[PDB]
Design a protein around this ligand. Structure first.
Ligand code: AVJ
Ligand code: FE
Length: 403
């Protein structure tokens, strides 16, 4: 197998304290850069945005990132235990007396987040700074040969912050907020197909390759059947002939859930489009056909596939291809699979017990990464998981077929 991600992703998961230190600093620089993009648009108004289930107020997100880091690092009396940490052991206070009522995503009700007496933006950024200084002081006590258990929570909180930075980016796109950061379409999209031979895949994350998310365990052998798979995610050039052929008016290409979704849509075409313009950073721009198709849900991906005589890969097929085919290029958009988000054999929840387990059975797996995913997070073993209707996320897909 090839490496699963860029050097930063391997270093965060397996590297020494100095690697995780650099990752925490890089994560915070990205968080604050995105916070400054939201500040330019919203002027530090709280809540600053209207209510929707797919949003959180930007200043709430910032406080949550700080709270999570402080909960699992400075206040955690069992850091050295790693995955054996008792999640509900007695903690000493937060810097903020109300932080546990305001920022714990498992405690604070969703709509409530718009109506809390939160600190102002400057005081929120001070909370971030003070908790990061605490975190880094504790990290600097660890020796170069620190065990995985010793580094576990430092790695976890770096990755958590990376996930919320990507959420800031897809929320921004929904809210028409322009960011300084952004991905670049290729001059020419690749349409090629690759052969994936029959093979055994050792799926998931092995005991000692460093940090694993709980949903990557246990590692387990699976059989891969021969297939031909797209070398890259489906481009808008490849997607749009489905729309031109009437695919959003032909219920027969759609599943039952896809038909129920399709019947409740005001606009019979992809999200964010009105050839076509695309709304990006609150500006209507001409659509680039070479870009990866994006903001498509699983129902839209599946219908395209039926129209094309192709299918989605399973997450195992995707992982196998990513690790074994040098021509398999990913990382532009998250890619819907056909696989429901379900535990691997031998799954056990890790100390952040609510990360995976509540979401089994209602989410679909996406693989890969998008342009707004941290280089430290993007990884071929990583399982993303969203409800199959979601279009706000930077999701697209690739297709495959029999040999
Ligand atoms: C793994 N995803 C991206 C589906 C998670 C990430 C997450 C952040 N804080 C807890 N979990 C999500 O959006 O809830
Ligand atoms: Fe979170």
């Amino acid at each position: 197998y090839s490496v699963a991600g860029a050097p930063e992703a391997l270093a965060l998961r397996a590297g020494p304290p100095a690697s995780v230190r650099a990752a925490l600093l890089a994560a915070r620089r990205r968080t604050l850069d995105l916070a400054d993009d939201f500040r330019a648009a919203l002027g530090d108004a709280y809540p600053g945005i209207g209510y929707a289930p797919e949003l959180n107020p930007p200043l709430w997100e910032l406080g949550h990132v700080a709270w999570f880091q402080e909960w699992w690092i400075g206040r955690n009396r069992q850091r050295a235990r790693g995955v054996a940490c008792e999640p509900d052991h007695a903690r000493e206070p937060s810097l903020l007396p109300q932080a546990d009522a305001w920022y714990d995503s498992g405690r604070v009700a969703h709509r409530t987040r718009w109506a809390l007496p939160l600190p102002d933006a400057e005081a929120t950024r001070d909370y971030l700074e003070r908790t990061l200084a605490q975190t880094l002081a504790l990290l600097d006590e660890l020796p170069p040969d620190a065990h995985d258990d010793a580094l576990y929570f430092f790695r976890l909180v770096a990755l958590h912050e990376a996930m919320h930075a990507e959420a800031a980016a897809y929320m921004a796109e929904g809210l028409g907020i322009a960011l300084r950061e952004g991905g670049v379409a290729p001059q020419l999209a690749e349409d090629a197909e690759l052969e994936l031979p029959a093979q055994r895949l050792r799926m998931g994350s092995d005991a000692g390759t460093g940090f694993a998310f709980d949903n990557e365990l246990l590692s387990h052998d699976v059989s891969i059947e021969p297939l031909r798979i797209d070398a890259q995610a489906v481009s808008w050039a490849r997607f749009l002939p489905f729309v031109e052929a009437g695919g959003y008016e032909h219920p027969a290409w759609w599943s039952d859930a896809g038909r129920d979704w399709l019947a409740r849509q005001l606009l019979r075409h992809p999200a964010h489009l009105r050839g076509w313009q695309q709304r990006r950073g609150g500006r209507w721009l001409p659509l680039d056909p070479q870009g990866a198709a994006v903001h498509l849900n699983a129902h839209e991906a599946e219908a395209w596939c039926r129209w094309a005589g192709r299918r989605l890969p399973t997450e195992a097929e995707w992982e196998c291809a990513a690790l074994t085919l040098p021509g398999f290029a990913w990382g532009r958009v998250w890619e819907w699979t056909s696989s429901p988000f379900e535990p691997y054999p031998g799954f056990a929840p890790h100390p952040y017990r609510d990360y995976s387990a509540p979401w089994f059975g209602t989410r679909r797996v996406l693989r890969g990464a998008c342009h707004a995913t941290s280089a430290a997070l993007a990884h071929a073993r990583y399982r993303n998981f969203f409800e199959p209707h979601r279009r706000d996320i930077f999701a697209g897909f690739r297709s495959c077929r029999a040999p």
